[PDB]
């Protein structure tokens, strides 16, 4: 079982990874205000065009 | 004491033992693994 | 079942193997044949520490064989139970040499329940005994006993069918018509040898004396036409064990009729 | 690879080392059997 904690350790980093995979994501998420600023009011500055 | 010395050396190099019997079996693993990859980069010149 | 967090079964690891192979049962050999010599000797200078005198002799030598053959059964018996122990780890290792990998899904199906491993608790508390059979019997220890009976009576007699083992105290000792004295030298032997296929005492000197000459010399006794060689002959202890009972008897019986000439003088 | 030609080599070395420890334990074996010999010398001169 300590061989199998030791298996969990390395799982947990493989998991520390994606959650670093998913910080890139929500970089992505922050690069998306880059455009939604324009993409967010497309939805409201055209009001009779929308 | 020395006697009981060599019944440890002996329970290690039955440890020993098993762990190369262990090494052989990740060894042809990796070998059946590289022979595969090999027969897939084959294939792909074939047609590249 | 969920009892328990680890699981019920698990697989065998090389780090855990290790110290599995490190696994070695006490040395009970050495202090076995130790004290089994310390009660031979100390059955050989009880014997030798007998007299005449000492009536009740029955008894003791009963309760000292039934010690003896109790000893024995125990020493036999822990011989039967480490070799089922041997036997039982020799079991568990070749169980543990075809056990899976370890991983989660394997934790998880044996959490869940999966009589895949056995381990060793089950097969050692309910382990088979070994019952052991064929008695030791042919332990020159065992041969000592009960040559004490039936000595009193007759030390220079020995009956011809004293060697049938068909008797379960050893021999059957009865009174026969048997020589105490070497024909080679014509002196009572202090140093007796006899041979398994010879089946004939003799002075280890006169032995010695008509041994050498010839590579091939057959015994001085009649009935027995095969040749008895250096190897052949073997070390009874009962012949030399008689022959000093007897001399202490007849030490015993000088110092008995010294004692009764100095009463009626 | 250079684990299991390490292991071999290990295994090896204590094979050898072991077939000498083991004449060396014979060896003392006889030489305390023959001691004891002597052992029972000195007991049955103090004995004396």
Known sequence: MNDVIGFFNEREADLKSQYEDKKKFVKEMRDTPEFQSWMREIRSYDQDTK | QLKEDINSRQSKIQKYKDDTIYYEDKKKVYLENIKKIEVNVAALKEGI | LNDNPIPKSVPLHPKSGKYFHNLHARDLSNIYQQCYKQIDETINQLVDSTSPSTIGIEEQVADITSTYKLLSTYESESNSFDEHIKDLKKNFKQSSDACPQIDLSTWDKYRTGELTAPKLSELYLNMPTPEPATMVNNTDTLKILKVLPYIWNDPTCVIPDLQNPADEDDLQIEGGKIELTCPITCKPYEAPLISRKCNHVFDRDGIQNYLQGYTTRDCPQAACSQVVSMRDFVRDPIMELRCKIAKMKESQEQDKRSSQAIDVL | ?48
């Open chain 4, 1 to 48: 690879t250079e684990k299991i030609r390490n292991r071999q080599e290990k295994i090896e070395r204590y094979t050898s080392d072991g077939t000498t420890i083991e004449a060396q334990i014979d060896a003392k074996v006889i030489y305390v059997n023959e001691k004891d010999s002597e052992h029972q010398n000195a007991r049955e001169l103090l004995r004396d």
